[PDB]
Design a protein around this nucleic acid. Structure first.
Lengths: 121, 154, 124, 142, 51
RNA sequence: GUGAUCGGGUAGGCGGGCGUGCCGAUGGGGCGGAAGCCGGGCCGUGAGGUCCGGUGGACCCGUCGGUAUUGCGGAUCCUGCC
RNA sequence: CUAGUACCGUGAGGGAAAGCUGAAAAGCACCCCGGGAGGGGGGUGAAAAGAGCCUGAAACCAGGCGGCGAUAGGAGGGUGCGGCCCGAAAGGGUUGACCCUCCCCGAAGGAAACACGGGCGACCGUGGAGUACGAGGGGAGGUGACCGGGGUUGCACCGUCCGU
């Protein structure tokens, strides 16, 4: 139970978001990296965002959650940096991601959105 | 069966291919090498015709690697050539074995193509010839292995 | 910082450093299949005379800065580990762990679990 | 391509300039090769070139040397002498050059350069001969 | 040990090294330290002092 | 801390290190796969060390102290293979 | 180990080589081809380890893949700059590869344009100016995925093997 987190995810929409990211990378255009998603949600380019649960130190993405909260972007959690970066399409880990021009997974993506709305409020 | 030896061929598919070998043959490996080069890539029917023409001495085989003191032959591309009859006979037997094996597998014998043909040096059988001034020198037989894989063309 | 600077120095120096091999290692298979350095000792040897156009010989100048000599490129000091009792007495701040190659899978798993608890970096 | 009229130019100085151009990377065409000049006494000059022409390998004349008798080829050979002929760089440079006797139809009414540091008013003494004279003495068709 | 064979050298002017060899076929080298089956150059000796 | 007043080297003298087999002790590994072999990485001026993958199927390594048939390119070297 | 044996010499006498299947023979039943030795399908076994039997190195040979390959000159290499190809992750890297721009400090060293003048001249002196630069030592923002390595090979410069 890390500190800068505020939510909990069941495995079901966890893996749902897994596929969402995998096929978003495949089909549309998406953006992987802490600075990257900072900038996404700053410029207001962010449709859906993901953060990792294996982030040492806790200084690296602590602000992403509040700044997304402020600009009203959906942001969820995923357990392993390894799987995160893998589904992002890399031989390397990865800590936070964002999606753009999301085709083929509107269903999935804004379903995660509504489930996280329910988990939030 | 009795796979005492193996093949240098990689990626063998049993649904499409068939194999045959000849082992410990008392023929020249140099002539084997030169002649298998020429049938690499042919259809079995064409290769059998070629081998019969060689055996009858109606078509020469080019000698590109092992060609010392060798005469040239009539026509275009010659250059040195020979007529290796013994080797051609043994290879004919190997090819017929391969055809049998493919047909008991279930492939079409008119759409088979040779996709692997290679000769290897086998073990030497040692001998001696008497010479002058009290010497005996070696008089040896060099042996050959030959292997063939055929594939069916879609 | 000073250590980062000296690691940079070491990296550059050991990129420029040649591989030190005996006189004619390229000519005979007896030298290609066991490549090593041996001192040339012959009266007429050009590599002994250190003549231009000829490969170089090892010297005490090619050595790395003392503070960073023997360190992993990460920057840590390696310690071979054959069991979990050897894990403690590692300082996770400057030491890291390398598990020995003869350790079986049963213990590999245990050592990795305890290292995860203690927060010790395992390089393999 | 730079086109140079060799009329009244000193052969060696011309050749030095041309070799440098070919090495720097330019295509060159020399015209009026027969009208270039060589300074000094006729007997010494002619003796040099005849001695050049009678040099051959004693065991086989198909292996050279092959020093020239014609004027365009004399000029070409001098330039070749000023290059690194034993390297690929020199061979490519030498391929970038062409030499012609007189002016062929293809170059008529065109811009002809001139090399100022080669010119015979520069000279004082009148002892000089012509490359065409040399070719005629050696037996060249021009 | 190594000192049992009877040997002969054929000497010089034969294209070969001057090496003691046995007299009957197969005429292999014998007795000397660098021959296979020969005496060992400096072997362990029971007269050495341990105490 | 000092070195403008140290930094080539044949014969040759002196100092410190790497590697190999067995013993007394000590710490350890191995059918969840030892030695050996093939291919690749990292450290080390270097002699060399260690890790990854593959092949293999039963033993092996580190440190302290002792001991030795203890390190090969060459002898018109020896044995065997090509 | 069927060794003072085989074998050599008229004879006294001389004198080799040669160890290891598997826990168990469970040592390949049955079918097609071949004159046959054998090949191919099938079987035993944890594993072919198949008696031409533990492991199975190097030299050498054949085929496949990659790079070069018929205007070309040095003992087969060294340094530097490029082209074609390959990738493990034990090396690194989205917790930021490479690259682009701007701010600060900066050793020894050190410009040019330009204003005047000296010299027959090639040039020089003065001020510009110890400025602009400058190995390197720090910072800030744009970018978003390679790098290090390896095989072979092109261009330029250098290079007459080893032991005595």
């Amino acid at each position: 139970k890390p500190s800068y987190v505020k939510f909990e995810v069941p495995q079901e929409l966890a893996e749902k978001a897994l596929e969402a990211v995998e096929i978003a990378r495949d089909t549309g255009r998406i953006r992987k990296g802490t600075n990257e998603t900072t900038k996404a949600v700053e410029r207001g380019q962010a449709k859906l965002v993901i953060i990792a649960e294996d982030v040492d130190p806790e200084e690296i993405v602590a602000h992403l959650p509040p700044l997304c909260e402020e600009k009203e972007i959906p942001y969820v959690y995923v357990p392993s940096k390894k799987e995160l970066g893998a589904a992002a399409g890399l031989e390397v880990p990865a800590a936070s991601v964002a999606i753009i021009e999301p085709g083929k997974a509107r269903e999935l993506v804004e379903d995660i959105a509504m489930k996280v709305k329910e988990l939030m409020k | 069966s009795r796979g005492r030896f193996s093949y240098s061929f990689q990626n063998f598919d049993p649904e499409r291919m068939a194999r045959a070998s000849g082992r410990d043959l008392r023929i020249s490996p140099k002539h084997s090498v030169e002649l298998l080069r020429e049938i690499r890539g042919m259809m079995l029917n064409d290769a059998l015709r070629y081998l019969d023409d060689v055996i009858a001495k109606k078509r020469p085989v080019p000698m590109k690697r092992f060609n010392d003191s060798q005469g040239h032959k009539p026509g275009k591309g010659f250059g040195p050539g020979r007529y290796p009859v013994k080797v051609a006979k043994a290879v004919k037997k190997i090819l017929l074995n391969a055809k049998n094996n493919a047909e008991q597998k279930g492939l079409d014998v008119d759409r088979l193509k040779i996709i692997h043909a290679a000769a290897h040096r086998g073990p030497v059988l040692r001998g001696y010839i008497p010479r002058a001034f009290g010497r005996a020198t070696p008089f040896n037989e060099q042996t050959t292995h030959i292997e063939i894989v055929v594939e069916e063309i879609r | 910082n000073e250590k980062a600077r000296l690691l940079r120095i070491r990296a550059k120096l050991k990129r420029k450093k040649p591989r030190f091999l005996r006189q004619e290692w390229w000519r005979y298979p007896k030298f290609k299949n066991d490549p090593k350095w041996r001192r040339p000792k012959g009266i007429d040897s050009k590599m002994r005379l250190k003549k231009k156009g000829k490969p170089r010989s090892p010297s005490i100048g090619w050595s790395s800065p003392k503070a960073v000599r023997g360190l992993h490129p990460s920057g840590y000091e390696e310690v071979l580990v054959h069991n979990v009792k050897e894990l403690e007495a590692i300082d996770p701040t400057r030491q890291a762990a390398r598990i020995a190659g003869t350790v079986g899978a049963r213990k590999r798993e245990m050592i990795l679990a305890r290292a995860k608890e203690l927060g010790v970096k395992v390089l393999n | 391509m730079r086109i140079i009229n060799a009329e009244g130019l000193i052969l060696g100085r011309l050749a030095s300039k041309v070799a440098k151009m070919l090495l720097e990377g330019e295509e060159v065409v020399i015209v009026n090769a027969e009208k270039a000049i060589i300074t000094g006494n006729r007997e010494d000059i002619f003796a040099k070139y005849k001695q050049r022409t009678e040099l051959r390998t004693r065991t086989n004349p198909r292996r050279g040397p092959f020093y020239p008798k014609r004027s365009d080829e004399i000029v070409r050979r001098t330039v070749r002498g000023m290059l690194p002929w034993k390297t690929d760089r020199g061979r490519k440079a030498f391929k970038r050059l062409k030499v012609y006797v007189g002016v062929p139809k293809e170059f008529e009414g065109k811009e002809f350069e001139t090399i100022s540091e080669a010119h015979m008013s520069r000279l004082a003494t009148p002892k000089y001969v012509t490359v065409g004279e040399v070719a005629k003495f050696l037996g060249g068709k021009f | 040990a190594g000192k049992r064979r009877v040997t002969e050298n054929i000497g010089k002017g034969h294209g070969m090294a001057r090496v003691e060899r046995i007299k009957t076929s197969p005429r292999f080298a014998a007795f000397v330290p660098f021959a296979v089956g020969g005496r060992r150059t400096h072997p362990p000796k029971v007269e050495k002092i341990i105490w």
